[model samples]
Target chain A: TSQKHRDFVAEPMGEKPVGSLAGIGEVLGKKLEERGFDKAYVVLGQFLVLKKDEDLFREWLKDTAGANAKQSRDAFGALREWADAFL
Target chain B: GDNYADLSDTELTTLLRRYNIPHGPVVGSTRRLYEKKIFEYETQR
Candidate 1:
């Protein structure tokens, strides 16, 4: 994991913006922001609800945010690494 | 004949992943197995 990305996960991630996630960028970020996943923590809630399963997380990323494999992998990777650190 | 160990990990992982599923080590002991996290299903209202 990238050091900076790891650093983000090392904390509680209470309510930081979703744009803060590793793979999230302008367009996708905007979509998520519109859907009320305004914060990284919100996504985390979804992650935990999925019990931190990577594949499921990837699918959800794709289905909900239209994230492609690479994007999904990167984003899911970010969350997985973060969960390992935090959860 | 129910044995399906011939199935590849990627196939199962793909199905499980979509559901936020079979958790923990993908190829490890049962001790690490995980439950599917139910999020929005609880708040359909």
Candidate 2:
């Protein structure tokens, strides 16, 4: 629904950073990377394993990355659309 | 022809790594989750 969402869903991502995701800003993205989610694939794992449940993934993102509601929602939508297009 | 051998730790490691599923190891919940996803990923591909 925004710039990040459009950019992310525009193409098939491979090994992009967590910071690349919507709302996963510097602090949250850095923490995630330190927790081994530096690469977006781990987030992809979350996306796939959680079966792309936006609610569940949003909460998980909030806890894992401390993203606010808008941020988590944006991230969720981005991934959801990307999967629809690519997955 | 659905005779798939058990995926080894290294193999699981590779699969998980390639898919980037929050890799830390290849056992227990991690193994089960990765295996399940791999099945889906393989099937989807």
Candidate 3:
């Protein structure tokens, strides 16, 4: 896993930008922000609202941000781990 | 891979607009298209 990924789940996400996530960068970040998912917490809320379903969350990322499989998986895994540790 | 052609123009337009995707035929992989755009933009930077 990327160090970014490890650091993200290591502590409270707080108000980090969506781009702060491992697989998310400026591109997906802007797309997500434009859709009102500007913050990591907002995406985390989505993860929870989807009941942490891997398929559902991954598909949501793909549909919304045009994230490919790897990107979708990395983001989901990060969020899933974060949730497990904190929520 | 969704068939963008299957969606009505209105549906297609709304999906692209709502997602802030650039105008284009919506067939094939939208994710790949977005990734391509992102790659180009980053490369130019």
Candidate 4:
């Protein structure tokens, strides 16, 4: 199977780290953690807090962590797409 | 540390405040500040 996500939504994220997300990796993950965004749900909290706006999240990621345009798009896109399916 | 000797008035003001120096009224600008940092500081007996 191609890495099914069927079980993730039904349960709590349970200490899941932000690096586990599809588009995030070590560099961006470390940068986010350095700025106090240390987990997946924390970023999710900001996503919900911002009401999931594409522009807001993208700009925030860039200015706060020096993320470039592509990195911002990928991180924001993954969260936005996931929220639509689950939230 | 590198000589912040090239810093402009605004930049020197920022650095001096960051280092918590009370650059008195006599110290008006970058040139004045650099004069203190580089030369006049030792002369202040």
Candidate 5:
């Protein structure tokens, strides 16, 4: 895992933009923003709604932001750990 | 499955609306509402 992923999972996301996520760069973040997920917490809500399942979350990320496997894996893993610690 | 079914119509409707989902046909059950959210989300992409 990259330091970006580790840093994100380490603390409260608060009102950070979607771009703050490990795997979500400008392109994916813009896509997510267009889909009403401008904030990282909104994506967090979707993550929780999907019950924190890695496969489901990964699929959702692909569908929502056209994220690749590695991107989805990094994001999913970060959120899973984040939820475990915070949610 | 069971999780979606546990939410009330009001709860589901609020969730859908909060997520900016468009209103359409009648949503009589939680599962249906959940599916509608998925459908809307998918269609939006």
Candidate 6:
């Protein structure tokens, strides 16, 4: 859980940027952003399509943006908690 | 007039809060449970 993880989970994600999510740094964020996932909610939309399935989400995150162990782990943690907290 | 079953349980969970009923999981109960709380909560109000 990084600082951004708690931050992301603290409130509604309304219009927040993709990088607001913990694991998504500039490179990954850019990779995702220009590729039709410009917002955190879109990624969230992607996450929920899998019903928050861990393996499936993690798989898609990497395939979507080249997220490695730490990045994917961090990203997945944020989305799952965000979903649990708000969805 | 509000048909609670027509809405999602989370909506029920939220509506229950408006009636000052304490219920949650944020994920919410089943729709039936949520509607029960509405009935139960309405009784208290």
lDDT of 4 by residue, A5-58 (tens): 323333455467877654566788898898788887887776665567767566
Poorest 10 consecutive residues of model 5 chain A by lDDT?
Answer: A48-57
Docking class of 6: incorrect
Q: For candidate 1, state the interface root-mean-square deviation in angstroms to 1 decimal.
A: 7.6
User: For residues B1-45, could you state the per-residue lDDT of candidate 2 as single tens digits?
Assistant: 422237776888888678765445554424555566577677888
lDDT of 4 by residue, B1-45 (tens): 445555666666565565555443223312443445433333442
RMSD of each: 11.9, 10.6, 11.0, 14.5, 9.5, 12.5
DockQ of all models, two decimals each: 0.08, 0.04, 0.03, 0.02, 0.06, 0.02
Interface RMSD of each: 7.6, 8.1, 11.2, 18.8, 10.1, 10.9
Runs in model 5 lying further than 4 Å from the true structure: B1-45
- What's the TM-score of chain A alone for every prediction? 0.85, 0.91, 0.97, 0.76, 0.95, 0.95
lDDT of 3 by residue, A1-87 (tens): 899899999999999999999789778889999988999999998777666778767766888888888889999999999999999
Deviation from native of the Cα of residue A3 in model 6, angstroms = 1.0
- The best candidate in terms of TM-score: 5
Q: What is the TM-score of each candidate against the true structure?
A: 0.61, 0.64, 0.66, 0.53, 0.66, 0.64
Residue-level lDDT of model 6, residues A1-87, one tens digit each, is 567888899999999999998899899999999777889998888777656766756766776688887888888889888888888
Chain B structural similarity (TM-score) per candidate: 0.37, 0.60, 0.38, 0.45, 0.51, 0.54
State the lDDT at B27 in candidate 6. Answer: 41
By TM-score: ranked, best first = 5, 3, 6, 2, 1, 4
Worst lDDT run of 10 residues, candidate 3 chain B, spans B25-34
Candidate 3 regions exceeding 4 Å error are B1-45
User: How well is each residue in A21-46 modelled by candidate 1, as lDDT tens digits?
Assistant: 87887788888777777899888877
Q: List the residue pairs that clash in candidate 5.
A: none
